[PDB]
Every structure is written in structure tokens, then in C-alpha cells.
Amino acid sequence: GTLGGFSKPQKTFVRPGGGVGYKGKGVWTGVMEDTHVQILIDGDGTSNWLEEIRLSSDARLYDVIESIRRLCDDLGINNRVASAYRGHCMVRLSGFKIKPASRTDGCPVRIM
Ligand SMILES: C[n+]1cn([C@@H]2O[C@H](COP(=O)(O)OP(=O)(O)OP(=O)(O)O)[C@@H](O)[C@H]2O)c2nc(N)[nH]c(=O)c21
Ligand code: NA
């Protein structure tokens, strides 16, 4: 179902010992469940996390969240970090679960 890729790849980097990781700002974009999606990502060299989710529509919201969770498993990206981004949302996503926008955990789910 999911189709997309990195419109802004994170930085690929080499760790001591030769391992290849990803860090810094990135953007993944594509279509999940008939919805255009942008996922803004950051990472510090030890983990990678969601900063914001941007959707073209909420018509398939909970299905899109499940597709985002599955993609984040493949990309090694968590939803445990409290993003500083706020505004333009009714809900945030935290641990891949929907929370009211009043909360501070996780990241906004912004319908554009
Ligand atoms: C570019 N990139 C690649 N990956 C990881 O590597 C998988 C393949 O990611 P990919 O489809 O972008 O292919 P590739 O990394 O080989 O890029 P190419 O060589 O130019 O064709 C992804 O499913 C992730 O596990 C990445 N994972 C993260 N977190 N961030 C990135 O920017 C990233
Ligand atoms: Na970290």
C-alpha cells in the first residue's frame, strides 16, 4: 500500500566500527491509505524520532497512523520524543497513539 521515499534524506554517517546510521533533519513523503503524507524526522546519532506529521486530509486518519507506525518500524524511527512543534492540529501522536492537541508529548498531526 504505502508508496513514498525521502524527499529530504537524513545525513548518512559512519560510526566507529563501520556501522551506517542516519541522523539530522529529514522528510519522508508519499501516499498511505489514499492520503498524502509528509513525516518530518530528526535524530542525534543515537535515535531518530518524529517531529511532525502532515496529512492532506483526516478522512483515513487511524489507518494512516497504522501505516506510519509500520514505516517507522522499517526506518527505525520512534514517537517517544516531545516535539517542540505546536499549532494547526486537533491531535498529537505519542507512542503512535492519538492524544488531544492540548498535550505536550509526541508530535502534531497537522492536516494541511
Ligand atoms: C536514506 N535512508 C535510508 N534508510 C534506511 O534504509 C532503508 C532503505 O531506504 P531507501 O529506500 O531510501 O534506500 P537507500 O537507503 O539505499 O537509498 P539509495 O542508496 O540512494 O537508493 C530504509 O527502509 C531505512 O531502513 C533510512 N533510515 C532513516 N531513519 N533515515 C534516512 O534518511 C534513511
Ligand atoms: Na537519543
Side-chain angles (χ1 to χ4, degrees), residues 1 19 28 32 35 45 48-50 60 67 73 76 79 83 89 93 100 106:
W28 185 100
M32 299 171 163
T35 308
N48 288 301
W49 59 85
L50 293 178
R60 299 292 300 281
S67 294
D73 207 6
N79 186 208
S83 175
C89 66
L93 200 72

Coordinates of all heavy atoms in Angstrom, one line a residue, residues 1 19 28 32 35 45 48-50 60 67 73 76 79 83 89 93 100 106:
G1 N 0.8 -1.2 0.0 CA 0.0 0.0 0.0 C 0.8 1.3 0.0 O 0.8 2.1 -0.9
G19 N 29.6 0.9 11.2 CA 28.2 0.9 11.0 C 27.7 2.2 10.4 O 28.3 3.2 10.5
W28 N 10.3 12.3 4.9 CA 9.7 11.3 4.1 C 8.4 11.7 3.6 O 7.6 12.3 4.3 CB 9.6 10.0 4.9 CG 9.2 8.8 4.2 CD1 10.0 7.7 3.7 CD2 7.9 8.4 3.8 NE1 9.3 6.8 3.0 CE2 8.0 7.2 3.1 CE3 6.6 9.0 3.9 CZ2 6.9 6.5 2.5 CZ3 5.5 8.3 3.4 CH2 5.6 7.1 2.7
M32 N -0.2 7.1 1.7 CA -0.7 6.0 2.6 C -2.2 6.1 2.7 O -2.7 7.1 3.0 CB -0.1 6.1 4.0 CG 1.4 6.1 4.0 SD 1.9 6.5 5.7 CE 3.6 5.9 5.7
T35 N -4.0 9.0 1.2 CA -3.7 10.3 1.8 C -2.3 10.7 1.5 O -1.4 9.8 1.6 CB -3.9 10.1 3.3 OG1 -5.2 9.6 3.6 CG2 -3.7 11.4 4.1
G45 N 22.1 10.9 16.2 CA 23.2 9.9 16.2 C 23.0 8.7 17.0 O 23.6 7.6 16.8
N48 N 16.4 8.2 16.2 CA 15.6 9.0 15.3 C 14.2 9.1 15.7 O 13.6 8.1 16.2 CB 15.8 8.5 13.9 CG 17.1 8.7 13.3 OD1 17.6 9.8 13.2 ND2 17.8 7.6 13.0
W49 N 13.5 10.2 15.5 CA 12.2 10.4 16.1 C 11.3 11.3 15.1 O 11.8 12.0 14.3 CB 12.2 11.0 17.5 CG 12.9 12.3 17.5 CD1 12.4 13.6 17.3 CD2 14.3 12.5 17.8 NE1 13.3 14.5 17.4 CE2 14.5 13.9 17.7 CE3 15.4 11.7 18.2 CZ2 15.8 14.5 18.0 CZ3 16.6 12.3 18.4 CH2 16.8 13.6 18.3
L50 N 10.0 11.2 15.4 CA 9.1 12.1 14.6 C 9.0 13.5 15.2 O 8.8 13.6 16.4 CB 7.7 11.5 14.7 CG 7.5 10.2 13.9 CD1 6.0 9.7 14.2 CD2 7.8 10.2 12.5
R60 N -8.9 9.2 6.5 CA -8.4 7.9 6.8 C -7.4 7.9 8.0 O -6.5 7.1 8.1 CB -7.7 7.3 5.6 CG -8.6 7.1 4.4 CD -9.7 6.0 4.6 NE -9.1 4.7 4.9 CZ -8.6 3.9 4.0 NH1 -8.5 4.3 2.7 NH2 -8.1 2.7 4.4
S67 N -0.2 2.9 9.2 CA 0.9 2.8 8.1 C 2.1 3.6 8.5 O 3.2 3.2 8.2 CB 0.3 3.4 6.8 OG -0.8 2.6 6.3
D73 N 8.8 1.6 11.9 CA 9.5 0.3 12.3 C 10.6 0.1 11.3 O 11.7 -0.2 11.7 CB 8.5 -0.8 12.4 CG 8.9 -1.9 13.3 OD1 9.9 -1.7 14.0 OD2 8.3 -3.0 13.4
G76 N 13.4 2.7 11.7 CA 14.0 2.9 13.0 C 13.7 4.2 13.6 O 14.6 4.8 14.3
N79 N 8.4 7.5 18.3 CA 7.4 8.5 18.5 C 7.4 8.8 20.0 O 6.3 9.0 20.6 CB 6.0 8.1 18.0 CG 5.0 9.2 18.1 OD1 3.8 8.9 18.1 ND2 5.3 10.5 18.0
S83 N 8.0 16.8 20.6 CA 8.4 17.7 19.6 C 8.0 19.1 20.1 O 6.9 19.3 20.7 CB 7.7 17.5 18.3 OG 7.9 18.5 17.4
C89 N -3.3 21.8 14.7 CA -3.7 20.4 14.9 C -4.8 20.3 15.9 O -4.9 21.2 16.8 CB -2.5 19.6 15.2 SG -1.7 19.9 16.8
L93 N 0.4 12.8 18.1 CA 0.7 11.4 18.1 C 1.8 11.2 19.1 O 2.8 11.8 19.0 CB 1.1 10.9 16.7 CG 0.9 9.4 16.5 CD1 -0.6 9.0 16.5 CD2 1.7 8.9 15.3
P100 N -5.0 14.5 22.5 CA -5.5 15.8 22.2 C -4.3 16.8 22.0 O -3.3 16.6 22.7 CB -6.4 16.2 23.4 CG -6.1 15.2 24.4 CD -5.5 14.0 23.9
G106 N 4.8 13.7 22.2 CA 4.8 13.4 20.8 C 4.8 14.6 19.9 O 5.4 15.6 20.2

